[PDB]
Amino acid sequence: GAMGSMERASLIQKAKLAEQAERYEDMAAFMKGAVEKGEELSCEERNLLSVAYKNVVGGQRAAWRVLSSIEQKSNEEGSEEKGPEVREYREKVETELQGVCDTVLGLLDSHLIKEAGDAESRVFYLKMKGDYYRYLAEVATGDDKKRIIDSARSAYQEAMDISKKEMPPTNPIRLGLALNFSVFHYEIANSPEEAISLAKTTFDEAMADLHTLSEDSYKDSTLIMQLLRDNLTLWT
Amino acid sequence: GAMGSMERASLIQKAKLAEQAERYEDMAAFMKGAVEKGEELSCEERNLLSVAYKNVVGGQRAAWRVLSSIEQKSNEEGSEEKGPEVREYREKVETELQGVCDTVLGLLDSHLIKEAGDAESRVFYLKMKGDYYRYLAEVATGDDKKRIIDSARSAYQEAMDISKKEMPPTNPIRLGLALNFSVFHYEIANSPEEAISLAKTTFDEAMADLHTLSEDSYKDSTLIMQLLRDNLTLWT
Amino acid sequence: FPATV
Amino acid sequence: FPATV
Ligand SMILES: *CC(=O)NCC1CC2(CCN(C(=O)C3(Nc4ccc(Cl)cc4)CCOCC3)CC2)C1
Ligand SMILES: *CC(=O)NCC1CC2(CCN(C(=O)C3(Nc4ccc(Cl)cc4)CCOCC3)CC2)C1
Ligand SMILES: [Mg+2]
Ligand SMILES: [Mg+2]
Ligand SMILES: [Mg+2]
Ligand SMILES: [Mg+2]
C-alpha cells in the first residue's frame, strides 16, 4: 500500500492532523497504513481508527439515504420516468460504501481481532465488526442479506458476552457496544422489543454502578447513558 | 476521461443528485465530464460547475489553513521539534488544492472562455478564472507568486470591464464579481483602500438601481449587497 | 435515526 | 474570513 514507506509514528501523527483538519478520508488512509504495520494498536490508536472510518462511512450512509429516497420516489405511481441515472448513482455510492466496509472488516480480520487479548481491545474490535456488517446490511437486498445480518449479530454477541464477563456495567466500551447492538435489533433485525429491553437493562445496570466512579469516569459513562435514554425516548 | 462514455444530460442529472447528497467531489467530476463534451454551458449548468468546485476547493482551503496554522506555531520560539510531518501533510493538501485549481483553470482555458460571447457567460468564467488564481495565490510562496497574483488581477479586471459596459449595477454576476475582486484587493494584493472603495461604490451603484427590479430580482441583488456591506463592516 | 457511537 | 461567492 501507499503508506508502506511511512513510519508508523508519522502515520499516527498525520492521522491526528487530519482529524483536526476534518480530512477523514486522509485520516482513515493514515490509520489503515498504521494498522498494516502489523503491531497491535493502543487505546488512543484504536480510537483514531474508529473515528476515521465512522466519519467516512457516515458521510456515505447519509448520501446513500438521500439517493435511495429519490429512487424510491421515482418508482411511485405517477412518477415520470427519468432513466437509469438515479439507480446508477445510488449504486455508485453503494459500491463505494461497501468497499470502505470491506476495507475495515479486512483490517479487523487481518489481523486485529486475532491478536486482541485484553477485554477492551477485543470488545472494541468485535463491536466494529458488528457495526461494519450492520452498514453492509443497511444496503443489502440479495441472496446473502441474511448471512450479512447474522455476521453482524454474531460479532455483537461475542463482544456482549466478553463485555459482561470482563467489564463493569459503566465501561464506555461496554455501553457503546450495547447502544449499537440495540440499534441493530431495532433497525436491522426487526426486533424492537429486544432493542428496547437491551437499552433499558444496559441503562439501569450502569446507573447502579455510577457510585463507584470518579467525576471524570462519571462524565464519560453518563454521556453514553444519555444516548441510550434518547433512543428509548424515540422508541417508546 | 472516466466520464467520456456518459451522456451529457446524464452527467448534468447526476451532478444535481450529487449536490442533493452533498457529494461535491462527485458533482465536480460530473460537471468536468459535461464541460469536456465540448458544448457551451447554460446558465444553470455554469452554476452547477461553479458550486461543485467552490465546495471542493473551499474544503481544501479550510484544511490548508488549519494545517498552516499548526505549522506556523511549530516554527515559533520554544516549540518542540516534531519532525517533517506537519510540513509534509500541509504540502499534500496544498498539492491537491493546486491540482483542483489547475483543473478548473484548464476547463476555462480549454475552451469555456474563448467560446463565451454573452456578457453573463464571459464575465462569470473570467470571475472564476480570477477566483482559482486567487486560491493559487493564497498558497504561493515562490518565484511565480507575483505572476499568479497578476493572473488573478487580469482575469478580474477583464470581467469588471465587461460587466460595467454590459450589465446593470444590480446584476448578481456583476455584484458577485465585485465582491470577490474586492476581497482579492484586501487579502491578496495588500490594497485594503481599493477593496473598500470597490465594495462601497458597487454597493451604492446597486442601491440606486434597485428601483428597476421585480421583487424576485430585488431579493437576489440585495442578498449580495448585504455581503458587500458585511465585508465593509469587517474592514472599517 | 437513532444514536450510535 | 471575508465573504465571497
Ligand atoms: C482503551 C481503548 O481501547 N479505548 C478505545 C476507545 C476510546 C473509546 C471511544 C471514545 N469514547 C467515547 O466515550 C465516545 N465514543 C465511543 C464510545 C464507546 C465506543 Cl465502544 C465507541 C465510541 C466519544 C464520542 O462520543 C461518544 C462516546 C471513549 C472510549 C473506546
Ligand atoms: C445566467 C448565468 O450565467 N447564471 C450562472 C450563475 C447563477 C448565478 C450564481 C448563483 N447566484 C447567486 O446569486 C449566489 N451565488 C453567486 C452569485 C454571483 C456569482 Cl458571480 C457567483 C455566485 C447564490 C448563492 O448565494 C450567493 C449568491 C445567482 C447567479 C450566476
Ligand atoms: Mg449494489
Ligand atoms: Mg438479556
Ligand atoms: Mg508546495
Ligand atoms: Mg474605480
Chain D segment 1-5 residues within 8 A of B by beta carbon are: 2-5
How far apart, in whole angstroms, are the C-alpha atoms of residue B176 and residue B185? Answer: 14
The answer to the question of residue A75 being in a domain is yes
Rounded to the nearest whole angstrom, what is the distance from the C-alpha of residue A188 to the centroid of ligand 3? 18
User: What DSSP line would sit under chain A, residue for residue?
Assistant: -TTTTS-HHHHHHHHHHHHHTT-HHHHHHHHHHHHTT-SPP-HHHHHHHHHHHHHHHHHHHHHHHHHHHHHHHHTSTTPPP--SHHHHHHHHHHHHHHHHHHHHHHHIIIIIHHH--SHHHHHHHHHHHHHHHHHHHHH--STTHHHHHHHHHHHHHHHHHHHHHHS-TT-HHHHHHHHHHHHIIIIISS-HHHHHHHHHHHHHHHHHHGGGS-HHHHHHHHHHHHHHHHHHHHH-
Can you read off the three cell numbers belonging to residue B126? 473570467
Output the nine-digit C-alpha cell for A205. Answer: 445496570
- Contact present, B177 and B163 (Cβ < 8 Å): yes
CB contact under 8 A, B23 and A93: yes
Give D1's DSSP letter. Answer: -
Method for structure elucidation = X-ray
- A86 found inside a domain: yes
- Residues before each break in chain C (C–N > 2.5 Å)? none
Residue B195 burial by CB count (10 A; 0-12/13-18/19+): exposed, middle or buried? Answer: buried
Distance of alpha carbon A172 from alpha carbon A164, whole angstroms:
13
Residue A17 · residue B86 · CB < 8 Å? yes
Question: CA B203, CA B30: separation in Å to the nearest integer?
Answer: 35
- Tell me if A93 sits within 8 A of A65, measured CB to CB: no
CB A66 within 8 A of CB B21: yes
User: Is B1 among the domain residues?
Assistant: no
Ligand 2 site, residue B173, Cβ cutoff 6 A: yes
**Residue range(s) defining the domain that contains residue A216:** 8-235
| Torsion sign (Cα): B65, B70, B75, B76 | positive
Count of Cβ atoms closer than 10 Å to residue A223 Cβ: 12
Query: Residues 6 or more apart from A106 whose CB is under 8 A from it?
Result: none
Nearest-angstrom CA–CA distance, A83 and A157: 43
State the smallest CA–CA distance between residue B40 and chain A in angstroms.
22
Q: Which amino acid is at A167?
A: M
Number of independent structural domains in chain A: 1
Residue B180 φ then ψ, to 5°: -70, -40
Distance between start and end Cα atoms, chain A: 48
Q: In angstroms, rounded to a whole number, what is the distance separating the alpha carbons of residues B15 and B31? A: 6
Q: Which residues line ligand 1 (CB under 6 A)?
A: A 43, 46-47, 120-121, 124, 127, 172-173, 176-177, 220, 223-224; C 5
Which residue has the CA at smallest separation from atom 14 of ligand 2?
A: D5
- Please give the full DSSP string across B136-200, using - where no structure is assigned: HHHH--STTHHHHHHHHHHHHHHHHHHHHHHS-TT-HHHHHHHHHHHHIIIIISS-HHHHHHHHH
- Chain B CB contacts of A20 below 8 Å: 66, 70
* Longest CA–CA separation in chain A, Å: 62
Resolution of the experimental model, in Å, one decimal:
1.4
Say which residues have a Cβ less than 8 Å from residue B209's Cβ, sequence separation at least 6.
B168, B169, B170
Q: Which of B162, B165, B109 is nearest to B133 (CA)?
A: B109
The Cα B169–Cα B198 span in angstroms is: 13
Q: For the purposes of burial, counting CB atoms within 10 Å of the CB of B123, is it exposed (0-12), middle (13-18) or buried (19 or more)?
A: buried
Spatial separation of the C-alpha atoms in residues B214 and A13, rounded to whole Å: 56
Burial B40-69 (b: 16+ CB within 10 A, else e): ebeeebbebbbbbbbbbbebbbebbbbbbe
Taking residue B122's Cβ as centre, other Cβ atoms within 10 Å add up to: 21
Residue among B90, B166, B87 nearest B123 (CA): B166
User: How far, in Å, CA of A39 to CA of A42, rounded?
Assistant: 9
Q: Report whether A93 contacts A132 (CB < 8 A).
A: no
Q: What is the residue type of A148? A: I
Name residue A37's amino acid. K
d(Cα B102, Cα A221) in Å, to the nearest integer?
A: 49
Can you give the C-alpha Rg of chain D in angstroms? Answer: 5
Tell me if B40 CB under 6 Å of ligand 2: no
- Is A184 within a domain? yes
Q: What CATH number does the domain containing A183 carry?
A: 1.20.190.20
| Atom in ligand 2 nearest the alpha carbon of residue B121 | 3
C-alpha cell at A206: 450502569
Measured distance CA(B77)–CA(B79) in Å, rounded: 6
DSSP code at position B41: P
Who's near B91: CB < 8 A, 6+ residues apart?
A: none
Residue A1 covered by a domain: no
Atom of ligand 2 nearest to the CA of B227: 26
Q: What is the Å distance from ligand 2's center to B7 Cα?
A: 26
Position of cell 445510488?
A90
Nearest atom in ligand 1 to A121's CA: 3
The answer to whether B159 and B126 are in contact (CB under 8 A) is yes
* Burial environment of residue A215 by CB neighbours within 10 A (0 to 12, 13 to 18, 19 or more): exposed
Spatial distance between the Cα atoms of A232 and B88, rounded to a whole number of angstroms: 46
Interchain CB distance below 8 Å, B10 and A63: no
- From residue A198, alpha-carbon distances to A153, A156, A228, B163 in Å are 14, 12, 9, 65
Specify whether the CB–CB gap between B53 and B104 falls below 8 A: yes
Asked if B125 contacts B133 with a C-beta cutoff of 8 angstroms, the reply is no
Q: Quick check: B35 and B107 in contact, CB under 8 A?
A: yes
Q: Quick count: other Cβ atoms within 10 Å of Cβ B214?
A: 8
Alpha carbon distance A170, B159 (integer Å): 63
How far apart, in whole angstroms, are the C-alpha atoms of residue A168 and residue A202? 11
Q: Residue whose CA is closest, atom 22 of ligand 2?
A: D5
Q: Which amino acid is at B52?
A: A
Q: Is residue B116 part of a domain?
A: yes
Please, which contacts does B40-45 make with residues 24 or more away whose CB atoms are closer than 8 Å?
B40/B112, B40/B115, B40/B116, B40/B121, B41/B112, B41/B121, B43/B120, B45/B12
Q: Do chains A and C touch (3 or more CB pairs under 8 A)?
A: yes
Phi, psi dihedrals of residue B118, rounded to the nearest 5°? -75, 150
Residues in chain A with CB shorter than 8 Å from the CB of B70 are 17, 20
Number of Cα atoms under 13 Å in the Cβ half of residue B124:
22
CB contact under 8 A, D5 and B179: yes
- Identify whether the C-beta of residue A100 lies closer than 8 Å to the C-beta of residue A112: no
- Asked if residue B209 lies in contact with residue B180, where contact means CB atoms within 8 angstroms, the answer is no
Residue A196 lies in a domain: yes
CA angle B138, B141, B146 (to 5 degrees): 80
Buried b (16+ CB within 10 A) or exposed e, A198-213: bbbebbebbeeeeeee
Q: Tell me whether residue A20 is in a domain.
A: yes
